[PDB]
Structure 1
Amino acid sequence: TKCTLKSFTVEKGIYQTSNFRVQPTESIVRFPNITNLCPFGEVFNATRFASVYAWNRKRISNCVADYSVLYNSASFSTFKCYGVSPTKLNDLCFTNVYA
């Protein structure tokens, strides 16, 4: 009650207080069963890429995306993500991927 009134002194009556007495004790993580590394097709390592007038789009489905291997494989000069932060991106699930 003192925290809500922001005063050590409290008068007689009934008060409604903001509820933050509960503290988190554990963290649980639930993601679907997919243990398969992504059939990227080595899209990053592909011998021939698409021309810019006819750009190739590839569907990505039913895998677990790991970018740690890609960073080890090659150093990327430009890595700009919009709408999703570059950090904690590995925590998040992605609905549909069209590279």
Structure 2
Amino acid sequence: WNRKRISNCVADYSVLYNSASFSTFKCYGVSPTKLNDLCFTNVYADSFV
């Protein structure tokens, strides 16, 4: 599993929440609406299959 550092940027998911090819967007606690309206800290994305 690779763990990509994400920082010093804005986390725009405008072409994410509205994309058709999503099947399992399982967000826990954070509503997928206010993804943009809530902030976070140093991001670390597990990318894998």
Is the pair's TM-score, using the shorter chain for normalization, greater than 0.5? yes
Shift of 1:84: 1.4
Distance in 1 between residues matched to 2:16 and 2:28, nearest whole Å: 19
Higher relative contact order (CA 8 A, sep 6+): 2
Q: Can you give the 5+ residue segments of structure 1 that lack an aligned partner in the other structure?
A: 1-54
* Number of residue pairs matched by the alignment: 45
Q: Which residue does the alignment assign to 1:98?
A: 44
Shift of 1:74: 5.7
Distance in 1 between residues matched to 2:20 and 2:3, nearest whole Å: 21
Distance in 1 between residues matched to 2:20 and 2:8, nearest whole Å: 24
Q: CA 1:87 to 1:94, structure 2 compared with 1: closer, same or farther past 3 Å?
A: same
1:14-54 C-alpha deviation (Å, 9 max, x unpaired): xxxxxxxxxxxxxxxxxxxxxxxxxxxxxxxxxxxxxxxxx
Q: Can you give the 5+ residue segments of structure 2 that lack an aligned partner in the other structure?
A: none
- Rg larger in structure: 1
* TM-score, length of structure 1 as denominator length: 0.39
User: Alignment RMSD, CA only?
Assistant: 1.8
Greater helix share, 1 or 2? 1
Contact 1:80/1:86 (<8 A) preserved = no
Distance in 2 between residues matched to 1:83 and 1:59, nearest whole Å: 22
* TM-score, length of structure 2 as denominator length: 0.70
Contact 1:57/1:98 (<8 A) preserved = yes
